[PDB]
Amino acid sequence: SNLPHEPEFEQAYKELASTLENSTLFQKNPEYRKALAVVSVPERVIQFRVVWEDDAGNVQVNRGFRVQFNSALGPYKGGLRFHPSVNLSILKFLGFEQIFKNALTGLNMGGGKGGSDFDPKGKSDNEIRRFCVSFMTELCKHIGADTDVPAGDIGVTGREVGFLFGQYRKIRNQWEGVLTGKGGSWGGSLIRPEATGYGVVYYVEHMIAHATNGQESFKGKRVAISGSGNVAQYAALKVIELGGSVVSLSDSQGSLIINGEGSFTPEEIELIAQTKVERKQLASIVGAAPFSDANKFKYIAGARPWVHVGKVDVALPSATQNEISGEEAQVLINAGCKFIAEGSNMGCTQEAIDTFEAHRTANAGAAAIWYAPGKAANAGGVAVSGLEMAQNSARLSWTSEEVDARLKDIMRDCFKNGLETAQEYATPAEGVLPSLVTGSNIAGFTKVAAAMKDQGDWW
Amino acid sequence: SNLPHEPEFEQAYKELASTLENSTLFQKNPEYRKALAVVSVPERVIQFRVVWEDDAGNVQVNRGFRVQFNSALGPYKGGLRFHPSVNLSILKFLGFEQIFKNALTGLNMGGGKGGSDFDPKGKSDNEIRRFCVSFMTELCKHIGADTDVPAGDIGVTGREVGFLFGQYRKIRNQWEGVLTGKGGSWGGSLIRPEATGYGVVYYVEHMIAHATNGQESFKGKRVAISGSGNVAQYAALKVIELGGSVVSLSDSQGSLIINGEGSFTPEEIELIAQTKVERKQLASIVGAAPFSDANKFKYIAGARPWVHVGKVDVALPSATQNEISGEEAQVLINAGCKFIAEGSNMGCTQEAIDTFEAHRTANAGAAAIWYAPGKAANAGGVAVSGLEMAQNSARLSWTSEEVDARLKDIMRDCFKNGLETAQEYATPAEGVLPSLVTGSNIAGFTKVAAAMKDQGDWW
Amino acid sequence: SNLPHEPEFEQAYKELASTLENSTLFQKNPEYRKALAVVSVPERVIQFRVVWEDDAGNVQVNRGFRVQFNSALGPYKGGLRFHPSVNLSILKFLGFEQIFKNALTGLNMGGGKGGSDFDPKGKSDNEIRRFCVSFMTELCKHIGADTDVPAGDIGVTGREVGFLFGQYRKIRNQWEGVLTGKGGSWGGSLIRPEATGYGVVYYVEHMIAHATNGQESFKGKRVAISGSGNVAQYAALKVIELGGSVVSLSDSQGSLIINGEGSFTPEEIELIAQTKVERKQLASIVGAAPFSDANKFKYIAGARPWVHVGKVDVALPSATQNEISGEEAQVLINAGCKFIAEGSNMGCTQEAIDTFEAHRTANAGAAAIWYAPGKAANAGGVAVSGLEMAQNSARLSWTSEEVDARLKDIMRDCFKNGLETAQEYATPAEGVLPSLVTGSNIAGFTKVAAAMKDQGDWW
Numbered sequence A, B, C: 001s002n003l004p005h006e007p008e009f010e011q012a013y014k015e016l017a018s019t020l021e022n023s024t025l026f027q028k029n030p031e032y033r034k035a036l037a038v039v040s041v042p043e044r045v046i047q048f049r050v051v052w053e054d055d056a057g058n059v060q061v062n063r064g065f066r067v068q069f070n071s072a073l074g075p076y077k078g079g080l081r082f083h084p085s086v087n088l089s090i091l092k093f094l095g096f097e098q099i100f101k102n103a104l105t106g107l108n109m110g111g112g113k114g115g116s117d118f119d120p121k122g123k124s125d126n127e128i129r130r131f132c133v134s135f136m137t138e139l140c141k142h143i144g145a146d147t148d149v150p151a152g153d154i155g156v157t158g159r160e161v162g163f164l165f166g167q168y169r170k171i172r173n174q175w176e177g178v179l180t181g182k183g184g185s186w187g188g189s190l191i192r193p194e195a196t197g198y199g200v201v202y203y204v205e206h207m208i209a210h211a212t213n214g215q216e217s218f219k220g221k222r223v224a225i226s227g228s229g230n231v232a233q234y235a236a237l238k239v240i241e242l243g244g245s246v247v248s249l250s251d252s253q254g255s256l257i258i259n260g261e262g263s264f265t266p267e268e269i270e271l272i273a274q275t276k277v278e279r280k281q282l283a284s285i286v287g288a289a290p291f292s293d294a295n296k297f298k299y300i301a302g303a304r305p306w307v308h309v310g311k312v313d314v315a316l317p318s319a320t321q322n323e324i325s326g327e328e329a330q331v332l333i334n335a336g337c338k339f340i341a342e343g344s345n346m347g348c349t350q351e352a353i354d355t356f357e358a359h360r361t362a363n364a365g366a367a368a369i370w371y372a373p374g375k376a377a378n379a380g381g382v383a384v385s386g387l388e389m390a391q392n393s394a395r396l397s398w399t400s401e402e403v404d405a406r407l408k409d410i411m412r413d414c415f416k417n418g419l420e421t422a423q424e425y426a427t428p429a430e431g432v433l434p435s436l437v438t439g440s441n442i443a444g445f446t447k448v449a450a451a452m453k454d455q456g457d458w459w
């Protein structure tokens, strides 16, 4: 062996493995232990130097990656992250999670992830273009519409997807669904920008309906969100549409919180969206209207929103991994939070998860805080990417209503699958909510493990 | 020339050619003689050594084949056979037949067939895995989703399809519809397991309705089936569903016959299915319940079912080529059999066909035994494979009801095409049933010949 | 950034960088600092899961790697290591070193390295075969005669090269010089087995001639060697041929030392070679003749040879990285050792190198211990691999005398280049031997950096 330390990956692996062990899965199918050992080593990883030219004519060097984790269920599928933290450990945690998330969508998509330690912050659009051109010059050897289909993630938006697609088409001389999150006129899907955030909210609608026996909904609930990028923006918009209140957003430098009762409006979210297109911080817009209104908004530098929002009903971490600590989880519980779903991949620390799950086991019915893992709740994005692939393969574009209806059905089925799987393999005490994390993990893992066995990846 | 003796291929060719000559086709289009000469030489054949390792560590050698017969109408399409009889002659008869069968489906599929003289009987699942891995290591150079799309046949089930698909994906680094008969979670189609047997029964429903002017159906009819694999199992299930009685199944070692009035049940077929998954003989299950009940079941070693079932209304040979002799055909006629359709490819000997066709010409209307050739009646399997290809290209999965409805429409159109083509080119005496073998052959051949001419394969 | 800890790679990088800084190179060409930053990030790295079947039928999982570090001077070139220590850090140190080593040969070869954490010890030949088959099934996508040409290294012999070549030819359907160290009848080169060890000794012949003004040679010198594989065996044979005494060999479990005056003989080396073919330890042969003769041989469990050989004139570490500690370096100096050359890649710890170099600076002429780095002294192996590539591209085989003559010329030129480059850029005090490590590093680095600039890798 002599294996390197990969803490993020180890964290994701340990949480999956623990939930599988804490169930009857390996009593019924002890041979799945072998499947777990095999699935946890990626099929392929490509790492590559990316040399690019800055606006001053200087040579810059970054590291590029694509983790092609598992392809039993379909071609490798998952986003690209451009963030200075990026390394193999991080991309492996993401790619591993992606395998099981993709399994929960019901579409034929394997799991992968890639990106670079290139930091889009402080770069010109021209610099981003030159970087994407160099990056894809190498990546295009390894991907393709029936091989590996990337998309965005942190630091990769429609702008970067465009520069990447352009360079792929130029070298490969094929116009195909090699990327998703593409633009409307060049093979994009309606609802793809909305999909992840909408899906998180759709999934939580099912959680609320089940836990409260149809008595409550998002109508009148206070929802704390973190991040202010793609997932946070559209989760906020859907909450607002359903009559809920969005009481926080955040970024890497601080939190922007609603002061008292009230909500972000669609118009305010659009202004924040335009700020983030320009790669600027929330801190840069709080000096002018409307965000300078200290009666509506409180900007807190260096803080996450969880301890500053007061009473809340729903928390949707939608920024990055490990953004809810164990302490923060306890404060959310103390604030009356009954629903927590990950928009962000591995948004909760392990301490947070353990806190939420202990609370669920100790508190009957609607009194419990119910935790839904990202692989279930944030699967709407990759699901709609699958639909974008389907549209590109049909050579036709579907309506917003058609894509959105399918997204709703996928999120419903994903919730049902996790709920019913937990009821079957990790049956809770009477009156206790089944574990959506355990259920989702078992449901995704078994589907992958069985397909791997069929295909001779293990025996 | 100096051509080798290929008896099976020569048989299939001669029967097609004879039916074309015994019609007005070459009076109207004498240039189609040229088309016949060209179509009868395969576009490409690949043969290859397959070295594989047995459970004792010993080197084993088998022969692999893929016959890519014709691609005018679409990429090459047809199954893989693993049986110790396999050779080029056999695979050419099958691939030749496949061209015209595929033409009758209305889908864009060319004709091919392949396989190996590897005998799955007596092998471990591990040995089957190692064999499929070695086999596909070579075959993957020659096939692909827009080139050649294999599937199962005798000795190749979903298990083997899985091992084959896995190895293809590993080498080719593409996840695509390169095989059909795939598993549910990795690009399979609902109704594909059922398709061939269901389709045979659907086709015969049309034969019964036409011959009897709507007065009879499968309800209350006695149906003798041979084989006990994929085609026989599902043909039996559909018969049962329509209110018919299944009075025989068989395998390579003997026949299992219903003793008197009665039928196999769905539960019994499932037990036989599980036996065949384990690659065991019917002889191995007649020593225990329910098949040890000598009042319901008679096991006859070394026999085909035809002379042992007594009176029957419908015969569906569903095992292998040349499994109804001339003598057996006469006994079926003497037993009151009025409908005979091939589930198996070239199930009837030429003597049998001649006997059935002479009887049709000598006996008006419903008094005739009506013979339907495999290229018409068993086309449901490859049709649903085409639909599996369509689903994989759409990147979506259809419902059981959707696939089954399309299968029903395809079988109806295939019957109508053969019936109407025979009425046009080989017009029977008044009151005489048109020849479905002649009609089907002309309809499939002309479609292929005309497409070949358009594409410059002949002029 | 967020880069992982890669100690071996960092060690190799730091030693190169330090020698470049401790010279006039960056005074003359400060722009080469940019070249250093670019060259130190590999062009491409492929990592992949390797699933293989053991003799009991169980699924085994190992990790495979190919580091394609630099291709300015030619296609990527360097060995494969199968050892349980293997990871990316180790393969990056090796691949980095390979760039500059290959530059010193005068042949068009870029730098790479690969392998697996698969441990050949305790495996059957059948298990090694199945592993090599699985390994190359993936690796063959990334390599080729004009792309990347691997070879052996620790744990990869002609046996493994054969299984690897066979699988490549099977999938890729090309017979070409994709590997070196091939067998005599299937594209191997005479002198390739000998090349690394012979070359180390040839290089040291030049060191001795220069330091002693032609007065001494290997004739009558005592030479301590470590390892007992390919490099150690043939270095020992060449020493013996030149009239030197070989006074030690070793393996991972202990050292086999000559007791007093005397030498290993060719016959004894052949017996050790046959033992190592069988993957057995030196410990397993000391219980029988000739190695049980305690008057000729002392086996010391758990020891390296350096402190146990007494007085020695030349040390040739030929096993593995970091196998001469700082303390061991001082004992060799105290034992009269005047020449130390690395057969093994990064054989000396940094402490050892610093000790040897301090001694050289403090002691005039022949009184100094003279250290030659592996990139200079062990380059004969990869040089003869280049010649094997040349022979395969010519489609002809050269004589032993032709290959050996070219190897001698390459080792002479490599020595001259390092010596003269050190005299130019790191001029020693009068009477002090120039630094072969500094000279070799500058000569290899500048050639690569300049070719990279020409090709637009940096500007």
Ligand SMILES: NC(=O)c1ccc[n+]([C@@H]2O[C@H](COP(=O)([O-])OP(=O)(O)OC[C@H]3O[C@@H](n4cnc5c(N)ncnc54)[C@H](OP(=O)(O)O)[C@@H]3O)[C@@H](O)[C@H]2O)c1
Binding pocket: A083, A085, A152, A153, A154, A155, A156, A196, A227, A228, A229, A230, A231, A232, A250, A251, A252, A253, A276, A280, A281, A318, A319, A320, A321, A343, A344, A345, A378, A379, A381, A382
């Ligand atoms: N996009 C998708 O379809 C999709 C699908 C499923 C899951 N996800 C997950 O959802 C999360 C958000 O992704 P996104 O697509 O919304 O990305 P995005 O548009 O780049 O937004 C990321 C947001 O999170 C913040 N953030 C990122 N890294 C951070 C760090 N290390 N510390 C603190 N804050 C950080 C950003 O702050 P700054 O504004 O300061 O840069 C920004 O507000 C990620 O975990 C992602 O993997 C995304």
Ligand SMILES: NC(=O)c1ccc[n+]([C@@H]2O[C@H](COP(=O)([O-])OP(=O)(O)OC[C@H]3O[C@@H](n4cnc5c(N)ncnc54)[C@H](OP(=O)(O)O)[C@@H]3O)[C@@H](O)[C@H]2O)c1
Binding pocket: B083, B085, B152, B153, B154, B155, B156, B196, B227, B228, B229, B230, B231, B232, B250, B251, B252, B253, B276, B280, B281, B318, B319, B320, B321, B343, B344, B345, B378, B379, B381, B382
């Ligand atoms: N599967 C398809 O979709 C498809 C489509 C169209 C036509 N067909 C045709 O349908 C027939 C049956 O195929 P299948 O898919 O059902 O195969 P299968 O599942 O392997 O079953 C074949 C059955 O036929 C018996 N059999 C095979 N070779 C024989 C021989 N040489 N002598 C006596 N009995 C033999 C087998 O006996 P044992 O059990 O003793 O092995 C078994 O009961 C074949 O002619 C095939 O080409 C198949």
Ligand SMILES: NC(=O)c1ccc[n+]([C@@H]2O[C@H](COP(=O)([O-])OP(=O)(O)OC[C@H]3O[C@@H](n4cnc5c(N)ncnc54)[C@H](OP(=O)(O)O)[C@@H]3O)[C@@H](O)[C@H]2O)c1
Binding pocket: C083, C085, C152, C153, C154, C155, C156, C196, C227, C228, C229, C230, C231, C232, C250, C251, C252, C253, C276, C280, C281, C318, C319, C320, C321, C343, C344, C345, C378, C379, C381, C382
């Ligand atoms: N082969 C080439 O052409 C070539 C060219 C240039 C440089 N090199 C370098 O030369 C050195 C030897 O390679 P080789 O081709 O001779 O390999 P080899 O035939 O496998 O022999 C390696 C020898 O070193 C010992 N060894 C390996 N790893 C060890 C460890 N971690 N600790 C202690 N002892 C260890 C082995 O002991 P066991 O017998 O106990 O296994 C064996 O005696 C390596 O540094 C290699 O990279 C090789």
Ligand SMILES: *OC(*)(*)(*)(=O)[C][C](*)C(*)(*)(=[N])[C@](*)([O])=O*
Binding pocket: A077, A078, A079, A101, A149, A150, A151, A152, A153, A180, A345, A378, A379, A381, A382, A383, A385
């Ligand atoms: O492929 C995709 O659409 C990726 C979506 C995403 N960034 C995720 O699931 O983490």
Ligand SMILES: *OC(*)(*)(*)(=O)[C][C](*)C(*)(*)(=[N])[C@](*)([O])=O*
Binding pocket: B077, B078, B079, B101, B149, B150, B151, B152, B153, B180, B345, B378, B379, B381, B382, B383, B385
């Ligand atoms: O391609 C297929 O689905 C083949 C079906 C079959 N075995 C046949 O038509 O003979």
Ligand SMILES: *OC(*)(*)(*)(=O)[C][C](*)C(*)(*)(=[N])[C@](*)([O])=O*
Binding pocket: C077, C078, C079, C101, C149, C150, C151, C152, C153, C180, C345, C378, C379, C381, C382, C383, C385
């Ligand atoms: O490519 C080769 O011949 C590699 C030789 C070697 N193992 C080295 O230089 O480390």
